[PDB]
Design a protein around this ligand. Sequence first.
Ligand SMILES: CCCCCCCCCCCCCCCCCC(=O)OC[C@H](COP(=O)(O)OCCN)OC(=O)CCCCCCCCCCCCCCCCC
Ligand SMILES: NC(=O)C1=CN([C@@H]2O[C@H](COP(=O)(O)OP(=O)(O)OC[C@H]3O[C@@H](n4cnc5c(N)ncnc54)[C@H](OP(=O)(O)O)[C@@H]3O)[C@@H](O)[C@H]2O)C=CC1
Ligand code: SF4
Lengths: 72, 115, 141, 161, 368, 136, 95, 451
Amino acid sequence: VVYNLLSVRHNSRIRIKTYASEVSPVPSVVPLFQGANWFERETYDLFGIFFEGHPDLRRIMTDYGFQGHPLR
Amino acid sequence: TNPTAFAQTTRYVKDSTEMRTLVLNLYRRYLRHSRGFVNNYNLDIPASQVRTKIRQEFERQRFVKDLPLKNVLYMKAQMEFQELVNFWKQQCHVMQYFESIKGDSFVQKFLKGAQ
Amino acid sequence: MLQDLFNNYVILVGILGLIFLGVNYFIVESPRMDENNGNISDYIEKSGPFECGFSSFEQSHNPIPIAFILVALLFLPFDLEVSSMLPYIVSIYSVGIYGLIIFILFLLILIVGFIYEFNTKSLSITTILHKKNKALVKNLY
Amino acid sequence: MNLEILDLSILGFYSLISSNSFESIAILVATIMPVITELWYNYSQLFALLYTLIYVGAVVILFVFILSVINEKEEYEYEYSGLFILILVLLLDDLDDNESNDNDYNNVYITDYADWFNNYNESDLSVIGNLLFTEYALLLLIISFILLMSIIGLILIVKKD
Amino acid sequence: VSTFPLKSDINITKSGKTLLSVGQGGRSSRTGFTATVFGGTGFLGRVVVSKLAKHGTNVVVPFRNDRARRQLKVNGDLGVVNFVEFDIRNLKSIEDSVKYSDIVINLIGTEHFSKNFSIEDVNIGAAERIAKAAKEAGVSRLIHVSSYNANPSSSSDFYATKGIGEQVVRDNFGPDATIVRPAPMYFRNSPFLNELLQIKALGGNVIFKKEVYPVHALQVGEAIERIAFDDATAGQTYELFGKERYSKKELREMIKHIIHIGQRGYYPYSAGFYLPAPEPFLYAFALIRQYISSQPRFNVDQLKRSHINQEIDQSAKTFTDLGMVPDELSEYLYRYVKPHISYTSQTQNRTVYSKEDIEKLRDYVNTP
Amino acid sequence: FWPMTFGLACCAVEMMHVSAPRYDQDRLGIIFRASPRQSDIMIVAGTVTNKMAPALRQVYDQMPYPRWVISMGSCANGGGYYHYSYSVVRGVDRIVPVDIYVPGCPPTSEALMYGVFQLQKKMMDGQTHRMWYRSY
Amino acid sequence: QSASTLTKEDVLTRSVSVLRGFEVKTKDIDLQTTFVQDLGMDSLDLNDALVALEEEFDVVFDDKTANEIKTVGEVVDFVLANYLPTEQSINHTIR
Amino acid sequence: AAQTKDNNDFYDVKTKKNDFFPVQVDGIESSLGKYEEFAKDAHEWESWNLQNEDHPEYPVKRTKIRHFTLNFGPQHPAAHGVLRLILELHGEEILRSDPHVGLLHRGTEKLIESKTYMQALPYFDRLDYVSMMTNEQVFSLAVEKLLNLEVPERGQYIRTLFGEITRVLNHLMSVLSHAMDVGALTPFLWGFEEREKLMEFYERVSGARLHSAYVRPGGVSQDLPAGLLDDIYMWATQFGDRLDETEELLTDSRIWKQRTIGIGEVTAEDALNYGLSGVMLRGSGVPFDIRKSQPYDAYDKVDFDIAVGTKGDCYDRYLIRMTEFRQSLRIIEQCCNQMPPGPVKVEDFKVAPPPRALMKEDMEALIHHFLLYTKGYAVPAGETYTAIEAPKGEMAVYVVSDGSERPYRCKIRAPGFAHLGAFDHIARGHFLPDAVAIIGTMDLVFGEVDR
Ligand SMILES: CCCCCCCCCCCCCCCCCC(=O)OC[C@H](COP(=O)(O)OCCN)OC(=O)CCCCCCCCCCCCCCCCC
Ligand SMILES: NC(=O)C1=CN([C@@H]2O[C@H](COP(=O)(O)OP(=O)(O)OC[C@H]3O[C@@H](n4cnc5c(N)ncnc54)[C@H](OP(=O)(O)O)[C@@H]3O)[C@@H](O)[C@H]2O)C=CC1
Ligand code: SF4
């Protein structure tokens, strides 16, 4: 799970890498960055990563009631 | 921003007793909204049949032991519930959900090329 | 004054409207001459409401809040005021200065209603959400 | 054949069987139209047009309120009535249409004699305005006062603020 | 339906060809068979063509209406459905339809007559011509669909021509021709149920007294699929009917409650739900519209058939001979009259009539 | 010739350029309608996904007859670049009947106009009322 | 109008009939009758009964109460204390 | 959260706090007896009700009615394609917005892993399909960075020249479609002829009006044809008048400003937190542009200015997008006057195809041509996050290389995907016609959003 952050102040970019499994919960950064709301939903939709604390986690790309996580 | 209707915050439950209560509460919500599913999706079956179908899906995962699998199963069961109540699923998808269902012998499969 | 010619015109207008319905009804090919998908009554997939492709909750009989209901109500008092000037329009000369002063008095009493509506801001839109800017403060120690 | 009799026969039938509130706002319009036409063709064309100018604006405001208050109640409800009891009721009603019992006043036709003395010849609306703005000017100014009260009254009822 | 409509991947036709099948039975699969469905644009042809094309059987659909055939192409993969412009008064076009087919299905048949075709031209003349053209083209299997009361010595010009058409099909194509006798078929846009679902049905006091054994159209389309792919059904006559007997008066009254037209005590009688008329008026009106109306209305012969009830030929074979259980109209009546229910639309709560509820309603209808 | 506004993907850009002043479909009587009730032509300009197919079929079913369907671009014809995708319909003719197929990725505005001209040619060969007289 | 018309005998009587339509060990149901022991309902059967008793009385059990319910009498107590008639339109009452 | 006694899915029993004193009343009596003597019959006596409906704690069971829910579905001119925007309205006031996407999700990221880097390039033409060449550039830049190569001087200028032609092509689509959705039909027609002239330059260099797989890792596929710059310069001499005529109908119009001023306000804090970039970020007062922050491909060798708003609404972003129109035209003129000679693609036949004349005479050229089109080129193992200033905003690709000729992972960061994720935050309070303005001011192409 990869987080690309931008700092407009210092004109700098940084990356955060963390790991996960098919059943291991991952903290949600939606409380910190409200712009991560949809990106976490897309990550779950196509991989199946358990984002704990997400206000509304659900499918965003695949069909309704779609079985499987395509990007695995 | 605000979450959509019937949305639950995702939480990793670490207690099997607390997980069991959350599953039973959700199972009741499926039963209560069964008449709503027949109304919105214009099903050709009574709500009594819908409640029977709900119980079968809950009975499939009756004997799942691992806690991490329980949370993922519970989380996916909540997402499906939010999908059905809010009428996000198209009516064709719900109709086919009730369309689901004796195996042939060796020779019978042999004659037709088997699987 | 003779309105017999006007009567014939009104008759023609009534008949002419039914011609558009009838002519379209007699001209369209029967459904069997088309793709032959049956009578329109059975084809529920065609007679259903348009919702841009996806069905939704059938909310036909639910009440709809109306944000301009106060303006709509105030239309009636002002509509009557406008309709009250019709007697003055065709009698302006006969009533003379006496009628003109009375006409102004009729309008001056109704202008107090206009002042009242402006000062009360009664002709606005009744929103249910309000955007207010909270101030961030720190209870330091 | 006086076809206004048939129009009122249909209107009375639909008033007995009306169920929801939209049908009632249509009974109103189905009532003003026979009034406007009969006034136009028999007694007063001025008041046939005044009815249209004022009542239509009231009808649309009435219709828009139906949208904000329609509450699902009478679409799915059931009524019993009976076709036989409806038509029998309308038949008994149609039997007696004599609002007055002075037979001579209802049967004997009369005439008026024209005179040429009125050489200043103007419309009824000019005379109505001439009297309303001169002799009954108090009536007009009270009506203006009542219209002002309605403006204040509507605001103090509806406005939440 | 199923997933693969064949008992094997190899099938030798009675004409001598050996046809292999490829795939598991999806849209991309093939069965090796070429079939010609005459009357495929009709009510039953759309059911039959869809079932053949979905499993990969190449279907030749001869058409006279260019618009009606377009929806048939969606049923099969590329190259599976083929169209031949044709007319039963044209012989070259009829041969072109059967030139490559191993199975020929004849669904052409009318209960009316018009300025161009009589009931004898269609139910006999076309069936005879198609059977002979099929034989000269070396077609291994012929399937002809007559009516439920086919009888060469019938008082009804439709029942008579259907009965004679059964004879002429066997006399031309030979003893191996298969004959199907469906009962009144109920489905979406079903001609049987459409007259019951119509509101202003004139003279229903006479027309709706006929009793029948209605059968699901999907099963009739499924049965024909079984017959074509099983050569043991050649030379056989099948009576496809439901287990239960209904009179159109019962179904007409049962439908009324499902459509909830009876919610008002006055509306059905005011709207023309009941339109009693003396039979001579029904005869004259049917006779008059036969030379004035351009669309096929209730004609004179259908008035005669209103008295004749459905008689099951006991010497013929049933669904059980095909290893299938007939469907029950009680379990399908609601979903096929569901489009016609007036308010529905999740107003307060839908009244979904289960199979048990339909039978309960039938008794209430029959209760005076 | 009143098509329905159904631009799904990059094939819609070329359909918008047909209405642009250079080609100006309006001069031929072609007007785009928002509602299916006022439309008689359905131009599928873009990829049809599994999530969209039921909505596309419902929108098609609501067009009063006579109705025609034009399939524009490789996505609508057979899937195109996304033929082997888990979420793409391999051709719009699996869902609705198609009267003409316009090729290209995207078809040019002239390629689409040529496809329309082919459909108008087929429409001018219709014999619906003589079919009643001579075939029924 | 907007008040309950429920008695303890009616609520018990309607509760017994709704519980009789299930597959219970005994048809002899009273207030003291437990769900697990006397009637023999597992986790899923009990919640089918609760929702069935919800639909009959147009009440909704809260999650805390539903998880902790033991006896038939507890249900009758809950219905009597929490039942309210549903609000009607502005025309049903005044007309 | 949790089904409780006074609040559940189907109804609630709402009680307000009691403002008045809790007055105690005991010993109710009439003149004929006490209350308990007649309380059995008091159910029929409305004047005997002890509960008052004006009391804040009066029990009322109110069914939970769905608010007016509208499918602003795919079949709608406002939605720029396939967007099932679900709005819960109070009359016309928006209370909650639920954008449903994926109606154009085609699994581009999944399909790219099955393609070589050269084969996967045309997929980028079809994400933001009005700004085609910019999409190819961000993929090309990421692959070139991983390859440790750099485009020669003339190649960089060509990507800058058509980078700004593409930017104009996008703003003509975005500004004028947004104006058309508001109700200004005429400017859409005028500017689309300018798109026709610009797409003529697209077709002359590549052979496709729209999907020109022209920007490739290492440079451009083919050199500029003879006489192209003169046509570009001739077009530029007139395009200033086209922009001015468009501003005559919109900029100072009172109707246009009433539709855009104060509509869709975004604070500079909320713009950063929600990840808005480009005009959405710049309209809120933040002067940030990727062409300035991380320069690339001869944007360092030209001069242009960035317009920054102060009120962060639809009118501010309209002015900014109109300034960018003129700033691109300023860059186009400079590139036409500064185009250098030399190779357009990298001088490396293990990445770029050799010339045909050399391919058919040189054995080593024929080997490289054979190997390039049958195996592609290997890219050293690693990963990158390369961003450009796309016309919609910040478009970036996260590419993972496994040392092979196929990309292990390719995540495309779509600027419109982030903008649509802030729509519910922005559109709350506004009316239904204002949602049309907010959708059009985000420049949403849903191929980019869904990909
Ligand atoms: C240009 C002509 C316009 C009118 C043509 C249509 C004719 C229909 C009747 C017009 C008015 C006749 C009197 C009706 C008064 C209103 C009563 C009513 O509810 O409308 C009747 C209409 C029929 O519905 P129906 O199915 O028969 O009955 C309900 C069964 N449960 O139920 C409906 O709700 C449909 C009503 C549609 C909207 C009609 C609005 C009223 C227009 C009146 C203009 C003419 C004034 C009346 C003239 C005739 C007087 C009898
Ligand atoms: N309840 C029922 O439907 C019953 C059906 N049957 C028989 O089953 C068969 C299938 O009929 P069904 O599908 O249900 O309804 P249809 O009335 O649509 O069947 C008629 C079919 O045969 C075609 N047809 C009729 N006359 C001609 C003609 N002169 N030339 C060419 N084609 C002609 C029609 O072509 P086109 O579509 O172009 O008009 C149509 O495809 C019929 O033969 C019918 O007699 C018997 C008992 C019950
Ligand atoms: S066929 Fe090509 S141009 Fe058309 S929608 Fe598909 S990818 Fe875009």
